[PDB]
Symmetry: C3
């Protein structure tokens, strides 16, 4: 484990995702509202999945070597197995908050799968220049997601209860800022141009992951928007 300088950030990430999972699990014990139960189930699964994948990276299972640039490059593939399941769950939290229609939910989840799937292909591609073709396709899929979150959901939240509109607006802004950083870290990190070393890259993804999952969840599960209007 300790033979890799980035191990400290993988261990911290593992701990923070595990602690986040347990807090949400305990906090959700005393909840019977069927609407609130939906948000607790979605939001608790997110850091639980991330916990297992951070642990796999810490123990060395989620790491492979990819030859490109005449070098064997360490690629943590477990990140994409994490994101494949956690990013659509996070979008479902937002879509259920605004009572989005089914067709829009399917478009979001499908574009998200394309985003993560093409990012994985780009991470494992051995022809250096082709890695950035996949990065560009994946980034186009992300821009579609961000467009929908702004010019489809925002207008839908305003016609909703005030507390669900204000909570959505906050979580929307958090998501757009944090998610946009991921393609940048990829491009300048060891998967892309190799400007930033792997140990610093790992620290950046850990800050982003914890903020986008545990920070996101703390804002959502403390809001009254997750409960139905009741007397």
């Amino acid at each position: 484990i300790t033979g890799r300088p980035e191990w400290i950030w993988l261990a911290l990430g593992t701990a923070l995702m595990g602690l986040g999972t347990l807090y949400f699990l305990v906090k959700g014990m005393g909840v019977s509202d069927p609407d609130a139960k939906k948000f607790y189930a979605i939001t608790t699964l997110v850091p639980a999945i991330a916990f297992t994948m951070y642990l796999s990276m810490l123990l060395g299972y989620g790491l492979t070597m990819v030859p490109f640039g005449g070098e064997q490059n360490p690629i943590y593939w477990a990140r994409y197995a994490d994101w494949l399941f956690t990013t659509p769950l996070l979008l479902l939290d937002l879509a259920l908050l605004v009572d989005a229609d089914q067709g829009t939910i399917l478009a979001l989840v499908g574009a998200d799968g394309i985003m993560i799937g093409t990012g994985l292909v780009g991470a494992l591609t051995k022809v250096y220049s082709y890695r950035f073709v996949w990065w560009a396709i994946s980034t186009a899929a992300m821009l579609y997601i961000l467009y929908v979150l702004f010019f489809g959901f925002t207008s839908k939240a305003e016609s909703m209860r005030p507390e669900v509109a204000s909570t959505f607006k906050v979580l929307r802004n958090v998501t757009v800022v944090l998610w946009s950083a991921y393609p940048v870290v990829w491009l300048i990190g060891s998967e892309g141009a190799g400007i930033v070393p792997l140990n610093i890259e790992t620290l950046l993804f850990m800050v982003l992951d914890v903020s986008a999952k545990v920070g996101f969840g703390l804002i959502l599960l403390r809001s009254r928007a997750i409960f139905g209007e009741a007397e």
Copy 2:
């Protein structure tokens, strides 16, 4: 790229799926009917997924070598990753058109997963004679799907609006004819008996894919069956 004679058909397929995706995306911009939005989302995702997998084959990522018959045989595995997601989406288009019940939808999607999954196992199997055992199981799963589309959905469409009944009947006939060709191309192509060479096999799958996805989508999204009855 150009070192493979089949590259021209992979490049054409990539272009036609990309163009198809963009047309459906633009055409769906001016749509607010929640029913129509469902069909546009399903139908636009189909060629978008196929685009990415054709590109992976063009660039050489979606290709592996499988030893059988005393030879290293080029097997494009990316086809099955495509079909795993696009064939159930196409069946969902048909099932939603006739307002099929949930139990029937699950049976269709499950049989479809078995069809594609066993076809993938057959494509990667190293014992030559066993490849055709998997082909037979996969073909049995397809025949179940075709039976349901005829002796379960057809009777359901007649009790529906006339425009949804006539549109379903057309898309049903297109699907049964085109899908039935796939097991035949597999059997006589490089995955099976090896009668037809890979470059011709690739041309045939490209014609079938574009017809079953973009041609299918053009018929559906030009129909009024996708809109609810409104004044």
Copy 3:
């Protein structure tokens, strides 16, 4: 095939899953109740999936070698591909029986995916002591599932029709007893401590699989709880 002593139990399992699939398929022909159709579709898919994965193990495709303990250990990875899809389908049978809320269904299916996913990682892990870390995480996920089936569903079934309450109680008890045996067989078998040899381990999993899928299905599909109350 016959070069492996466990082949006899893989062949028996294949036959019993295939026969089970055909019986459920025939029995479900004469069913039009939309509620009953749901249970028949879920319950017939379970042994059909298991059939294909037992066949892959029989023919040698679903087997790999994992080095640990200074030895190349035969690991049947196809079991986890089976369980990944069949265990959530079995939980869906139970959840639909008691009309569970959506949030609870998602929590069950998500915990089940974590259970199977971490068990697969543990089966393929090359550092011997780490294999049991994954076993423990997977077992914690199972205990969560069992808790929900007892202290969330049981109370919900009592407020239901008497026949659905008594049928659920029976299937609940069958599930908790049979599922609990799996982590024990893993721990003492070739994936874990290696006390029980592989051929005996394979026999035990076959008895458990057939009971948990075909036996489970025979109890459910003979009950009147799967039909709506009708005159």
